């Protein structure tokens, strides 16, 4: 496995990361799941060409 | 703005990134996306643990 950097206002990480640690979900975890939806559905939420 | 470390497997990044960079969407972002709906929602779609 291998790490990557990611880049967000400080203010958002720390809402998202404040539910995920109070349902007992890792960070890590919380995006890993996310990399495979963005992987199978290939159209996401909002999928802004930015 | 800050910076975090994500882990995953590399074989699952690569379909991931594979797929939001030919949406044109940066990875940054779609990331940046999902830690709105986990803090929004506060459940995750499935918080599965292998």
Chains 1, 2 share one sequence.
Not at 11 to 21: D, G, I, M, V
């Amino acid at each position: 496995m291998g790490s990557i950097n990611l880049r967000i206002d400080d203010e958002l990480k720390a809402r998202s990361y404040a539910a995920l640690e109070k349902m007992g979900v890792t960070p890590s975890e919380a995006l890993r799941l996310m990399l495979e939806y963005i992987a199978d559905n290939e159209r996401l939420p909002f999928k802004q060409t930015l």
